[PDB]
Design a protein around this ligand. Structure first.
Ligand SMILES: *[C@H](C)[C@H]1/C(=C/c2[nH]c(/C=C3N=C(/C=C4\NC(=O)C(CC)=C4C)C(C)=C\3CCC(=O)O)c(CCC(=O)O)c2C)NC(=O)[C@@H]1C
Ligand SMILES: *[C@H](C)[C@H]1/C(=C/c2[nH]c(/C=C3N=C(/C=C4\NC(=O)C(CC)=C4C)C(C)=C\3CCC(=O)O)c(CCC(=O)O)c2C)NC(=O)[C@@H]1C
Ligand SMILES: *[C@H](C)[C@H]1/C(=C/c2[nH]c(/C=C3N=C(/C=C4\NC(=O)C(CC)=C4C)C(C)=C\3CCC(=O)O)c(CCC(=O)O)c2C)NC(=O)[C@@H]1C
Ligand SMILES: *[C@H](C)[C@H]1/C(=C/c2[nH]c(/C=C3N=C(/C=C4\NC(=O)C(CC)=C4C)C(C)=C\3CCC(=O)O)c(CCC(=O)O)c2C)NC(=O)[C@@H]1C
Ligand SMILES: *[C@H](C)[C@H]1/C(=C/c2[nH]c(/C=C3N=C(/C=C4\NC(=O)C(CC)=C4C)C(C)=C\3CCC(=O)O)c(CCC(=O)O)c2C)NC(=O)[C@@H]1C
Ligand SMILES: *[C@H](C)[C@H]1/C(=C/c2[nH]c(/C=C3N=C(/C=C4\NC(=O)C(CC)=C4C)C(C)=C\3CCC(=O)O)c(CCC(=O)O)c2C)NC(=O)[C@@H]1C
Ligand SMILES: *[C@H](C)[C@H]1/C(=C/c2[nH]c(/C=C3N=C(/C=C4\NC(=O)C(CC)=C4C)C(C)=C\3CCC(=O)O)c(CCC(=O)O)c2C)NC(=O)[C@@H]1C
Ligand SMILES: *[C@H](C)[C@H]1/C(=C/c2[nH]c(/C=C3N=C(/C=C4\NC(=O)C(CC)=C4C)C(C)=C\3CCC(=O)O)c(CCC(=O)O)c2C)NC(=O)[C@@H]1C
Lengths: 66, 161, 50, 160, 161, 160, 161, 160, 160, 161, 160
């Protein structure tokens, strides 16, 4: 059940001379198992979670999950 | 990721002004309340599992949502629901210890509404359930600490709503 | 795309310790989700998938 | 089911189903009619299995139906029997599917977490399901009882 | 992914009632056609590359699209086109074996149309090409199995369009 | 083999074999005698399978035996027939094992790279194996030919 | 990793000869014993935790090792010990199902004695514990399957020793 | 310990101990004598706490000491009483140390795994430890009972 | 704040605050009145601290206020004195917070990049803050001046 | 990334034609100006720090933006602002050397609007600042080179706007 | 091109073009006259290079144009010469660019996949391009031939 997510990762830890746009703003497909762990990590990093969609799977399915 | 002290100094920093006597009054009030907050946190932690069990029993159990085709039917979904309530309680006590709602917004409510609607989790039912948690917690921590617990519980309710 | 092919191959070299042309019947990795797509845009996901 | 399992493996391996996997789904197809028959008799004797197996569990566990036990009182014992009925339904699904996938997803992912939140003892739940297995096996023929017993065995092993 | 059996069992599970008599009949029907499904899968597994080659030659070759500026010109784009066709054929055989289009929905069609539009892939050309694949594979497996195969290939066509 | 594949998957997920996998290996065990019989007739007729299939392959792909082709000259033709014999042997191994694991482990891992170093065309190798499949299927009974032909089908699919 | 069938065919593959009649005989013997192997694996899959519990009680409990300072003392160390017994029993059922001890040597007994020496685990006591496991599992699966389980359990003991 | 926890955190931060962390160590040093006296009275009343609290636990949970329960039989009941003595011992260590580090390292980590293998219900273990906390509270002054009660609270919360 | 850091650590390990971490925030709560007093005298004497320290800094290295120095002219000197006031109130925020997190966030990350973009010498900034520390120490009691001095020391180290 | 030569040969490749004499003329023209492009790049590489400093002083400094609450306030924010200006100038010199705007269009401009709007960074102020950079860099490199650079600076301005 | 590749590397390491890199950019631009002259020669003789080299390829590898081969028939042979024409065009582009990234971007990324899908022999395509290189040696002076030869070398090396 891959979740399509859109998120930001502003970082005050350092000022980066190399490219940072790629990591800063991104959309990724995160599987259902990973999403809670990733949600907690990005929320801890303090980035704003702009958007979430259920790219694969169905909103509710008792069995037959991906 | 802020507490009461961080919020006070950051607000003064946004103004650009130095620490004011009114700002220090806010800091004094938080310090005076600090010990009360700490003991409440210990009680919440020790009885956290029981708080969740009692609140779920009084709010969600023996109802249509736990009945088949109700979004908490199936063991996997029931486990996720109780886990989410556990996390709500833990982040609530973090916010209570901080004396600020910043943690709730930064680490809980962000994306929570979007994810819950994406999966169609019943947001009204969750709000009712955490209100049940709120009264159980009020009984355990006491009236004084319960009022502080209440504002952060209601803050989470507002974010879900 | 030039760099993308290099980085895909490099992920093979680190994860499997060698280029995988020996020891695979067919190439069993769809790198298209990582390449010009957001499905495995996270190399943090491509490495994990491998 | 076996078919979806084989397709999942083939999709990961990026290959069409190997002759071995095709052979396995063949055999599942051939025994599908017997699997349906086993499920039919299980649902026919749905109530009998749950009722008498639950009574056997209560006989071996006085603590369960005693004060301080989870299924204490008539209403609580009724809800416990409801859970036993749910597990029987899952077992019939699993027999029809030919694999443990529906049983695992519907009623075994976090079974301990759910029961811990409820306060219910997991080994006692396992004993109840064992009693259900015995009753179902008596109803079934020897060959049929063996097929259904395997799914019951997986459930009790997960309960442990 | 959901098999035909998985979908039927899932519907019964959502109801919470045991397998209905109509549900049993659905399961029996899938078992009846299962052996034919296995045979067809074996056939197009052996001739997968040939099927793709024939379809590409039938519609995608010696045309403006393969000539310069037509999106299939350039070596990398041609390789991407042929592997897309083998992707379509392989997921089509997965769906045929499964007896349901759930695999196509979840693993293929999602984002496929939008990404093709962003890249500039000619969706009409791809739809015609997989139609040519349908003709070739139907000849190889047989009319009865091909008719069953066509519903899933057409499902891919509709999602692309 | 099916047994080792089941054990490998179970070990990867760190759980005992599910009843589905156990039933799978049980049915394979039951049909073992038929599998051995199919392998026995294949090895009994190995010589003619290779010989006449090779002749059909040469007709199908004249460029192979033409000047400049990989199997040009009697010596080169002899070694290609030897390769066909090797793949027949692998197919008998795979049928006995019940899985394509031995075929893959012995003659399909890096098959593309080995042949490109040799200069030999992989699709032409696939055509030769298709001819071997036809001869073997004719020798076998209809039910037996379906299984052995499926193993040949995996080999040609990998060659492609 | 190998099994009986894989070992037989690999032995013939090194020669390059087709399967001769003696090799066929070895394969026939494995097929003859396979049914009881499957039954035994299903039996101890059901009783896995109980087998570990019985063996631990038989030799590892109410002894100095589980008393303070004994190495099974401390809750972590107790969990690690029962985890190792779970490991050994699961790999024993793998080896019994395969009909070959290659799994044990490949995944269990390589670098096991050295790690135990570094950890301070008593190799002798582990050998005793898995001997007790061997008794319990033999009783559950039956006598002849008990002989088969025993050879692989003894193999594990020898590797530890 | 306060010292070990501060030094762990500073080691991860690769810093000489922060002045505030040193201040906490100073205050822990000064309060150590009160901690020692609290631990002293607990170990002096070891016997009364265990027997009184255990009888409270069995009243609260008659199921565990009933036949068909984990502790039924004087010997099994005695070993559970030993477990209660063990946990009181760990709590005395924790009171002296100033952190949970000793408590969690010695026990309370793999607690669910150990007790699942043993068959005991870990919430019932938590109830016994709660009873110990009540008895210890009675034996301590209100200030002292608060300090010891926190460590008991951590133990019961981890059990649940 | 230490409260913030404790919550972060517990959140990382997905645990409620341990009794030791709770005791840490208890101690900081009681320390708050002392910390507020130190910050209050700093803000009461903010003008005096800035002025004489600035004159001392210009006396120390007059190249800053000489022609060719970054702060040559009355407007430039005024803005640098404004920066000194900025850093002093940063230190007041750090003192009440109890840790240096507010100071770092407001005015440290990228310190070299900011002032070298401006063309200002960071060693000269260090001497200016040193003068501020000396004047602040005079206005603080010796026991109190240790606490404020630590934040000043961190700031000058970060300036370098 | 694309350049003048790459653009010319890419256009010929889309045409499917070998290099025409007109295409060779375009390449000759780029070669003719490549000499001036190199020395302009050397000049602003050496003076890059001065250029950013001067532009920041001209428009960004002594304003409410760098005063408290203006989003450029805070040392981290100031460092990020000058870092972005360094990025823009470095990418501008890359585009000037190449003779093509592809690097700006792909590496820089895409997504920059979304990130700036999300963070609250004032795009109008950034456009004003890089306009000031354009004036300063034109003075340093010279008039002809300033014409070459200014188009790429304006390209970035339009992307931000 | 050399300019774009230098810019790419400098972009990755976040550095303005180094003085030596600037020298290389300047040098390539200046010698662009010679580059264009070489490309002009090749496009002037596109017809004979392809025609003569393709005939040499057919003679060296008769199997490609034999019956049952990829190039059998005048239609297929016309397409084969068309492919050689495409590769010569890419080589002229690469000479003009001064780098092989245009050649790779257009016609060496996935040649194995495309040609194997077509059935064409990849080593045979490499040998045809070798024939084009040998034909090129006569057309270009020794100093010029070395420059064009390197681009031909990359094409054949990637092909194999
Ligand atoms: C319980 C009151 C209700 C309920 C809940 C339910 N939630 C999910 C799934 C998710 N919940 C979250 C939310 C969070 N993730 C976090 O890390 C945190 C802490 C900051 C929260 C609050 C997420 C990310 C998911 C999806 C992934 C996951 O399961 O973790 C489910 C599962 C749905 C499904 O399986 O398809 C459920 C059932 N359900 C109810 O009926 C209650 C009203
Ligand atoms: C019976 C063998 C054991 C036992 C059980 C017991 N269960 C409950 C309450 C609930 N049980 C469930 C279980 C499920 N929900 C599911 O979706 C599934 C899988 C499909 C299962 C198994 C639920 C949801 C509840 C609560 C709400 C509801 O009824 O829906 C109780 C009552 C709790 C109480 O004591 O108050 C009991 C007693 N009790 C035993 O003694 C057995 C060992
Ligand atoms: C000639 C040296 C060898 C050979 C080749 C051969 N190729 C084809 C068919 C095609 N070749 C291409 C090649 C390219 N497409 C590109 O975009 C590029 C880079 C710019 C190249 C090189 C393509 C696209 C085709 C498909 C047909 C088409 O153009 O539409 C054939 C024809 C195969 C057929 O049956 O149709 C042949 C024969 N054959 C030989 O014998 C030589 C060794
Ligand atoms: C062939 C029929 C036509 C064609 C296709 C073409 N596609 C791409 C790129 C992509 N193709 C896919 C498709 C899939 N990805 C998957 O994981 C699956 C499994 C279900 C499929 C079907 C995707 C996602 C992409 C984008 C990512 C990427 O770039 O690889 C290209 C490449 C475009 C380019 O410019 O490089 C092409 C050419 N082109 C045609 O002309 C045919 C009509
Ligand atoms: C106690 C209130 C409940 C209870 C417990 C019970 N425990 C056992 C057996 C064991 N308990 C332990 C515990 C520990 N080992 C440790 O190292 C630590 C930390 C220092 C602890 C807490 C162990 C090792 C055993 C095994 C026996 C042994 O020590 O050798 C039993 C006996 C189980 C049996 O039937 O054999 C019981 C009954 N029982 C209850 O009813 C209470 C709720
Ligand atoms: C139980 C019978 C005896 C015992 C065991 C004990 N073992 C460990 C630690 C480890 N054991 C292993 C062994 C394995 N790892 C594996 O993956 C497998 C199967 C492939 C095996 C057999 C390993 C790696 C460890 C260390 C890592 C870990 O903690 O798991 C301990 C812990 C020692 C410690 O203090 O760190 C113990 C106590 N103890 C006994 O008293 C029995 C005789
Ligand atoms: C000071 C002792 C030395 C010195 C400094 C100097 N600074 C400036 C200009 C600025 N300084 C800042 C500093 C900050 N901005 C922040 O947000 C924070 C944290 C809250 C700090 C510390 C800024 C933003 C400026 C720019 C002007 C503005 O504020 O808008 C100058 C003026 C430089 C000029 O020529 O314009 C000077 C001189 N100079 C010295 O000699 C001292 C050693
Ligand atoms: C200066 C003119 C203005 C200004 C800027 C400012 N920017 C940021 C943060 C970011 N800027 C970028 C932009 C880029 N990243 C890149 O890699 C490139 C080159 C391709 C560019 C142009 C990004 C990605 C960020 C966010 C991540 C990061 O920190 O780098 C900030 C910080 C915002 C914050 O508080 O987190 C600021 C202040 N501010 C101004 O006042 C000027 C008008």
């Amino acid at each position: 059940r891959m979740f399509k997510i859109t998120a930001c990762v502003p970082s005050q830890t350092r000022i980066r001379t190399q490219r940072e746009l790629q990591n800063t703003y991104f959309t990724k497909l995160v599987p259902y198992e990973n999403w809670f762990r990733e949600q907690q990590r990005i929320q801890k990093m303090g980035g704003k979670i702009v958007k979430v969609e259920l790219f694969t799977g169905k909103p509710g399915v008792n069995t037959g999950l991906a | 990721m802020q507490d009461a002290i961080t919020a006070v100094i950051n607000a003064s920093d946004v103004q650009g002004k130095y620490l004011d006597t009114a700002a220090m009054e806010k800091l004094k009030a938080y310090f005076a309340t600090g010990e009360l907050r700490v003991r409440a946190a210990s009680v919440i932690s020790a009885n956290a599992a029981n708080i969740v069990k009692e609140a779920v029993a009084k709010s969600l159990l023996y109802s249509d949502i736990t009945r088949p085709g109700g979004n908490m039917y199936t063991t996997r979904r029931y486990a996720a629901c109780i886990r989410d309530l556990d996390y709500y309680l833990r982040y609530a006590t973090y916010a209570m210890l901080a004396g600020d709602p910043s943690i709730l917004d930064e680490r809980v409510l962000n994306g929570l509404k979007e994810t819950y609607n994406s999966l169609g989790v019943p947001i009204a039912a969750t709000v009712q359930a955490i209100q049940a948690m709120k009264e159980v917690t009020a009984s355990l921590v006491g009236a004084d600490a319960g009022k502080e617990m209440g504002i952060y519980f209601d803050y989470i309710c507002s974010g879900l709503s | 795309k030039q760099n993308l092919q290099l980085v895909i191959q490099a992920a093979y070299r680190q994860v499997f310790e060698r280029d995988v042309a020996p020891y695979i019947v067919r190439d069993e990795f769809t790198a298209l989700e990582s390449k010009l797509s957001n499905g495995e845009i996270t190399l943090k996901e491509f490495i994990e998938a491998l | 089911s076996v078919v979806t399992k084989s397709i999942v493996n083939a999709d990961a391996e990026a290959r069409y189903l190997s002759p071995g996997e095709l052979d396995r789904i063949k055999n599942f197809v051939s025994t599908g009619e017997r699997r349906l028959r086993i499920a039919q008799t299980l649902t026919e004797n749905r109530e009998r299995i749950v009722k008498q197996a639950g009574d056997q569990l209560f006989q071996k566990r006085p603590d369960v139906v005693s004060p301080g036990g989870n299924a204490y009182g008539e209403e609580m014992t009724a809800t416990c029997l409801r859970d036993l009925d749910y597990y029987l339904r899952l077992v019939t699904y699993g027999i029809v599917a030919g694999d443990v996938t529906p049983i695992e997803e519907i009623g075994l992912v976090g079974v301990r977490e759910m029961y811990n939140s409820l306060g219910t003892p997991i080994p006692a739940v396992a004993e109840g399901i064992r009693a259900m297995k015995n009753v179902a096996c008596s109803l079934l023929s020897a060959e049929d009882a063996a097929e259904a017993g395997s799914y019951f065995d997986f459930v009790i092993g997960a309960m442990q």
